[PDB]
């Protein structure tokens, strides 16, 4: 609800959705990073802040299409902020009606189940649910992650197998 409060405040104080989402997400991200670091340092443990920043950016990088415009984005869908911004830009570039959205905070399990590869998600949790959803959507997996070149048995796209 802190995210919602920040979004509501910024969508007026500023007036543009994209910047309101950016500022709200920034403030919530800073809060989350600081809280995690404080909890860790209470016991006298030190980790760099980049390690927590990567996780927080994996948790605060999505948006709910509140009400779509001429976009192919139906309401209720979770999409990356960058993709939504680019689509809205090209849509009002041609002169269409853009879409509205609300930034969201996912979590460490809800964000891992929203990946674009069903093999990674099915191998994490709720295998039957993920597999049923993938079968219904007719999804295809292009094997662009470490857990999927690991499962099939290819060179992982990281490290000495980068290219």
């Amino acid at each position: 609800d802190l995210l919602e409060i920040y979004y509501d405040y910024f969508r007026e104080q500023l007036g543009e959705d994209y910047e309101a989402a950016l500022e709200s997400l920034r403030r919530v991200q800073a809060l989350l990073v600081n809280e995690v670091q404080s909890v860790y340092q209470s016991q006298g443990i030190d980790i760099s802040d980049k390690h927590i920043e990567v996780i927080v950016r994996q948790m605060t990088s999505k948006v709910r299409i509140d009400d779509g415009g001429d976009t192919i984005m139906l309401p209720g869908e979770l999409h990356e902020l960058r993709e939504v911004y680019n689509s809205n830009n090209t849509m009002a570039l041609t002169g269409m009606a853009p879409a509205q959205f609300t930034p969201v905070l996912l979590g460490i399990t809800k964000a891992s189940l929203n990946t674009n590869s069903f093999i990674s998600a099915a191998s994490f949790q709720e295998t039957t649910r993920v597999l049923t959803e993938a079968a219904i959507e007719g999804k295809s997996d292009w094997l662009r992650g470490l857990k999927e070149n690991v499962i099939i048995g290819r060179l992982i796209p990281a490290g000495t197998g980068f290219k």
């Binding site: 079968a135 295809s140 470490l146 099939i152 990281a158 197998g161």
Partner: protein, 1042 residues
């Protein structure tokens, strides 16, 4: 005042034999068929027992079972003709409990564990809503049957939830029981609270009450008054489907304040009404009502072999009665006799399953007498009727104040079983209801009355009294000294004047178990290191020549007499025959007693159970004097380790992080060497091609590898077998003379020793061979193991270590008299782990060596002085210094430290170090494993796991993550495919390595193909695709399975 240590296991079988089987036979005795023409009566009070066949030793050596046969007299009565054909029927085979508290099942010693469960009765609880008030519920739990939950709503409503079904107001249940409004109104004390429910839910009459009860219990069927009545009768009133138990009746009467007889063991109207009244009073805060704690040891019970057996016998008897009724009604003619009517198969099967395949009957722990003793005094919270590992949480595994003197707060496992398995304390005992008691001395006007007999008391009893610990100090006669005395009042620790103390514990070690009672200077140790030492004392290995501790604790002679391996003379006379296998003592004026000693037998844990005599021929012997001793005892008392010279200082890195540096004397003086006997087995089966033959005509073998076979294909007793040596020679008739194939049994890699026994069992000899086998050969191989690099050494105070170096005695530091040390320990490990007691024992052991003495110090010895342990050790060291005459033994500037020199250079170390005599143990367990290529799994084609089958090490997903973080791609890909399940890439990689070429690129591992097939088998059209290169082409599905 210590009574028999293994008595929780005897009393429960003596009880089973005396009145546990009788109650269950009589409870099912009158069997009647549906026509009511024939009746079988089981006169179960006269069950006789047939003497055991074979023997205890014969059962052990034959790999059989030690049991008896049960015969009960029966009488088949014809309801009309009246012909009664009295007879005695065979009921089953009952395994018998040996003199040590154990059973011998399939030639192996097993022990039935004791289960700590929740006691039957009624338990009240108050739950608080997020925003609502306190609402109270009650649970009525029987020994066996359905539960009866009562609940109070937020509006003042009373609900009942039979089984796990939906709730129903209490009025339905009370009217269905056959109670008018006036009686349930009179019995309740505050009737308006229930009148609210009556008004809100409507006064049900009996007929509609039963209708609604049937409707709610069994929906979808037309309600029927009789239907409901029968449902209730079968649910809570059927003597053969609901049993409160004796403890259940006792608890119900004690809690609810009823007076019902002890014989009635089913729910009655009075019970439910009372329970409801108590719930109402607890809601209204009457004053004499209180919610229950489920972890209290007064609401928890112990079940042992007697109860668990009774239940199994009951199940078997139900099955037997079903079979009897079926084979009684079908018969159209009364040509049946009681012998032909009963079938003992279900009862035999139930008992066999209980004693062989249950999770409450456990393979005995038999490493040493201490492990054996504490395995029979173990209390478990898991099993058929207790908890599960995923359901047990933080609350259940903690120490409840009510454990004081009944369950040890120290001795437990570490890991997933921490807090779920406990050990009975030293003086605790279990009464006939199943509650743990503990003894106390009475205190009158501040005087401890040790003249009167100890008053035992349970957890609930000792909640209103002020109980003092067993370490309070009293003066001459009995008066308690001091002005303030610690007491426990209502599960709390307080202090009182010593005129208001009600009871005092019998001993200072009344709170701990037997393994923890064997740690000297325990009050100078942390509790975690005390746990480690107590756990590790039960993993010590009996050594070649055992030796008593010098700083023992006083319970050693008692901890060894219960394992039943020490022989004491019951007779005050002379010894007439001494031998390695036989002792004979002639009573001063009387008969001769003869004892046979076990020699180099084998335990469940491959240790040796030797027995040796102590006395010599023509020796005067008194009653109760030790005559023979076990493998871990010296002369009466436990002996698990050895006393060695220890110094506390760091070596050149060999003491680093719990590593241990020892001398070479521990190897060539045969200190810490042990005998381990292993068993190998070979089976001659009958294949469809033909049978298998044990013979020396093994193919592809020369006569240089058949030297030690006994012209029958089996190795000879007394032969030294090295690795890969043939033990039993076997040939199989393979199908493809030059037709036999070799699958003879050989020693596993890394095993050697002498062959000490080769037992043979064939169906001709009258032995119970497996279903499809025709010869079972068992070979026992014994070996002597010395201490070596990689072995674990331990002390009694929790200090463990792994030996990392064995130095020649001219490199070890030495004393100012030339004596090299035996072990050097790092002092860095002492202060951070707070096991200071090890620094006391060493010093006292040093004094004991110098004074030719042995000290029996009891834990918590500071009730006599301000610092008793330190003062005793200093005085003893000074006395040793004065008696010996050597001033370097003890120094006044540094009491526990003396000068030590360097064996490599001869220069003394800068400062004196602490040296002493320490009692160290050698721990069990054969862990080194390696693999290149071996057997593979069936479905996934991945290497098997396990040392005994050349198994591989698992590369989990944490290791995959670690390799991904490194940037490793080729190590990961080679590990994942070529070395696990790339069924074609394994052979190519191996061939490339052998030939010296480069390893080719891998393919798709077999587990992926298995997964794709399984997903397709789940009606999923998952497939792998190759994208089209040009424009006007379709993507092509790739066939992996080719």
């Amino acid at each position: 005042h210590l009574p028999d240590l293994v008595a929780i296991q005897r009393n429960s079988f003596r009880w089973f034999l005396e009145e546990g089987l009788i109650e269950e036979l009589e409870s099912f005795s009158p069997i009647t068929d549906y026509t009511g023409k024939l009746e079988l009566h089981f006169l179960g009070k006269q069950y006789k027992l047939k003497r055991p066949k074979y023997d205890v030793d014969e059962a052990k050596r034959r790999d059989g079972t030690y049991s008896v046969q049960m015969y009960v007299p029966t009488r088949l009565i014809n309801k009309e003709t009246g012909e009664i054909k009295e007879q005695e029927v065979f009921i089953g085979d009952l395994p018998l409990m040996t003199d040590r508290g154990t059973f011998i099942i399939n030639g192996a010693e097993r022990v039935i564990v004791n289960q700590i469960v929740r006691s039957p009765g009624v338990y009240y609880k108050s739950e608080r809503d997020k925003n609502g008030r306190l609402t109270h519920n009650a649970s009525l739990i029987p020994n066996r049957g359905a539960w009866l939950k009562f609940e109070t709503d937020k509006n003042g409503l009373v609900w009942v939830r039979i089984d796990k079904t939906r709730k129903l107001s209490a009025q339905v249940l009370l009217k269905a029981l056959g109670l008018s409004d006036n009686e349930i109104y009179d019995k309740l004390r505050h009737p308006e609270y229930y009148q609210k429910t009556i008004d809100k839910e409507g006064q049900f009459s009996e007929d509609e009450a039963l209708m609604e009860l049937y409707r709610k219990l069994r929906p979808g069927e037309p309600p029927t008054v009789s239907g409901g009545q029968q449902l209730l009768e079968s649910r809570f009133f059927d003597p053969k489907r609901y049993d409160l138990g004796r403890v259940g009746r006792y608890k119900l009467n004690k809690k609810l304040g009823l007076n019902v007889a002890d014989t009635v063991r089913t729910l009655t109207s009075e019970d439910i009404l009372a329970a409801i009244d108590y719930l109402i009073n607890l809601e209204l805060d009457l004053g004499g009502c209180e919610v229950d704690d489920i972890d209290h040891l007064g609401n928890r019970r112990v079940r042992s072999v007697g109860e668990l057996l009774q239940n199994q016998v009951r199940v078997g008897l139900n099955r037997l009665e079903r079979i009897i009724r079926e084979r009684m009604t079908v018969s159209d003619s009364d040509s049946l006799s009681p012998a032909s009517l009963v079938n003992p198969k279900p009862l035999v099967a139930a008992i066999k399953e209980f004693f062989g395949s249950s999770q409450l009957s456990q393979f005995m722990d038999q490493t040493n007498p201490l492990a054996e003793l504490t395995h029979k005094r173990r209390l478990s919270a898991l099993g058929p009727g207790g908890l599960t590992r995923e359901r047990a949480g933080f609350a259940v595994r903690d120490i409840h104040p009510s454990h004081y003197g009944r369950i040890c707060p120290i001795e437990t496992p570490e890991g997933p079983n921490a807090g779920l398995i406990g050990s009975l304390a030293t003086h605790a005992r279990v009464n006939d209801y199943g509650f743990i008691e503990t003894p106390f001395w009475r205190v009158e006007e501040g005087r401890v009355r040790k003249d009167l007999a100890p008053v035992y008391m349970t957890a609930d009893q000792e909640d209103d009294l002020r109980v003092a610990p067993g370490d309070v100090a009293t003066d001459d006669a009995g008066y308690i000294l001091g002005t303030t005395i610690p007491v426990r009042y209502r599960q709390d620790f307080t202090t009182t004047t010593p005129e208001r103390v009600d009871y005092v514990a019998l001993s200072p070690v009344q709170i701990i178990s037997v393994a923890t009672s064997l740690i000297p200077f325990l009050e100078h140790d942390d509790a975690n290191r005390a746990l480690m030492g107590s756990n590790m004392q039960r993993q010590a290995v009996p050594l070649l020549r055992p030796e008593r501790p010098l700083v023992g604790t006083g319970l050693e002679p008692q901890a060894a007499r219960d394992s039943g391996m020490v022989i004491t003379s019951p007779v005050d006379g002379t010894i007439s025959y001494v031998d390695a296998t036989h002792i004979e003592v002639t009573a001063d004026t009387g008969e001769k007693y003869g004892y046979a000693l076990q020699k180099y037998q084998r335990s469940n844990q491959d240790t040796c159970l030797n027995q040796r005599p102590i006395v010599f021929e023509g020796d005067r012997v008194q009653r109760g004097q030790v005559i023979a001793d076990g493998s871990a005892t010296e002369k009466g008392e436990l002996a698990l380790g050895q006393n060695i010279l220890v110094a506390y200082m760091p070596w050149e890195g060999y003491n680093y992080e719990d590593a241990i540096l020892i001398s070479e004397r521990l190897v060539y003086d045969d200190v810490y060497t042990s005998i381990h006997i292993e068993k190998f087995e070979i089976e001659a089966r009958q294949t469809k091609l033909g049978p298998e033959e044990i013979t020396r005509e093994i193919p592809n073998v020369g006569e240089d590898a058949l030297r030690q076979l006994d012209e029958n294909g089996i190795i000879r007793v007394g032969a030294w077998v090295e690795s890969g040596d043939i033990l039993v020679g076997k040939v199989t008739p393979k199908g493809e003379a030059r037709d036999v194939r070799d699958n003879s049994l050989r020693v596993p890699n890394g095993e050697k020793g002498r062959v000490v026994d080769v037992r043979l069992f064939t169906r001709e000899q009258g032995d119970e061979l497996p279903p499809g086998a025709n010869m079972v050969v068992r070979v026992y191989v014994a070996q002597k193991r010395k201490i070596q690099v990689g072995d674990k050494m331990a002390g009694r105070h929790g200090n463990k270590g792994i030996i990392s170096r064995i130095l020649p005695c001219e490199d070890m530091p030495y004393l100012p008299d030339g004596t090299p040390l035996d072990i050097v320990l790092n002092p860095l490990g002492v202060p951070s782990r707070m096991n200071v007691g090890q620094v006391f024992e060493c010093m006292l052991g040093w004094a004991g060596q110098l004074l030719d003495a042995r000290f029996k110090v009891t834990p918590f010895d500071e009730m006599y002085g301000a610092e008793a342990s330190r003062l005793t050790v200093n005085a003893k060291l000074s006395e040793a210094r004065e008696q010996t005459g050597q001033p370097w033994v003890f120094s006044d500037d540094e009491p526990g430290k003396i000068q030590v020199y360097d064996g490599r250079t001869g220069e003394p170390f800068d400062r004196p170090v602490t040296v002493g005599r320490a009692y160290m143990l050698k721990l069990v367990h054969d862990k080194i494993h390696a693999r290149s290529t071996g057997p593979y799994s069936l479905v996934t084609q991945q290497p098997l796991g396990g040392k005994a089958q050349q198994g591989g090490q698992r590369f989990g997903e944490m290791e995959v993550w670690a390799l991904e973080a490194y940037g490793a791609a080729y190590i990961l890909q080679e590990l994942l495919t070529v070395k696990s399940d790339d069924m074609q890439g394994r052979n190519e990689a191996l061939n490339a390595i052998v030939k010296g070429k480069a390893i080719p690129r891998p393919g798709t591992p077999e587990s992926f193909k298995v997964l794709m097939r399984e997903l397709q088998s789940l009606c999923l059209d998952i497939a792998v695709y190759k994208a089209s290169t040009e424009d006007y082409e379709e993507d092509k599905e790739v066939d992996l399975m080719a």
